[PDB]
Structures are given as structure tokens and as C-alpha cells.
Design a protein around this nucleic acid. Structure first.
Length: 104
DNA sequence: ATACTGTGGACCAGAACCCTGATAAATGCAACGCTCATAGCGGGCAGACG
């Protein structure tokens, strides 16, 4: 908590515009406190630090974040974009994205 | 009467406590490590349906 509160002063000294935390899939749920003290950390982090934050993970790492609105509303305070693999035939005709990517 | 014994008084120098400086040794405090309770995940092992 002391470092979480020290980060706010520094992030407000220089006008930080964004904060990206990448690869949350790599965290261990045994050295952190469980599946609840991670969510509490990631929800307290958004409130105190005034900058926008972005969280990136794998579909099996959403089980941490699906427990409550504290990241279903705070985390999805601006939506939740989903990445999918390319589909060959979305319509009756095959997708032009696949053809263009393969040709290039 | 006047010259000698005793004595009152003014008086210098050893000395004791205070001040100064430099070096060594005994504490006090801010910082760091030890210990105990509490919570939990995941793997390895006693009883299940097959």
C-alpha cells in the first residue's frame, strides 16, 4: 500500500497520460494472495492513480476479473475489445482480409 | 630626663580553584532484522464408479 500511494505522487509530478500493464496471465495465484487479493489490488490501483490504465490478458485470465463489477464496470468503463482469429468465410464469399494477407 | 624591648601595623609570594584546549571512552537514538499469527493454492495420497 505504501508503494501504491507513492506511485500517485510521482505519476502526478509528470503528467502521465496512460499506463499499460501487459501479460497479466503470467502472475501466479499462490504467491499473490489468491483470486481475490489480485482483484482488490487492480481495483484500488484505478481509483487512487488518476491516469487511465489498460489491462491485457488471455481468455483464461478473465476468471480473476469476472467476479464483480469492480472490473466489469471499472475495467469495462470504456468497453472490452475482443480479439478473434481470422475467419475464412464470414459471409458466403470468403473474406478478403484472408486473401489480402496471404497474398502480401 | 634619653637609649633598648616589645609590639602594632603594613605587606609580598606560595598556592588553590577556575578557565581553555585536545584526546579517549561510555550512552542514546534512528535504523534493521527476528518471530508469530493468518490466509490460501496446488499437488500427492485415502476411499469412489467402472
Amino acid at each position: 500500500e505504501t508503494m501504491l500511494a507513492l506511485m500517485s505522487q510521482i505519476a502526478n509530478a509528470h503528467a502521465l497520460g496512460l499506463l499499460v500493464i501487459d501479460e497479466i496471465q503470467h502472475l501466479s495465484r499462490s504467491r499473490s494472495g489468491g483470486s481475490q487479493e489480485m482483484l482488490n489490488f487492480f481495483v484500488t490501483m484505478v481509483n487512487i492513480i488518476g491516469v487511465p490504465v489498460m489491462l491485457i490478458g488471455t481468455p483464461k485470465a478473465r476468471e480473476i476479473f469476472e467476479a464483480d463489477l469492480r472490473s466489469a464496470r471499472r475495467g469495462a468503463g470504456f468497453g472490452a475489445i475482443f480479439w478473434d482469429p481470422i475467419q475464412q468465410t464470414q459471409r458466403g464469399k470468403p473474406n478478403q482480409e484472408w486473401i489480402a494477407f496471404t497474398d502480401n
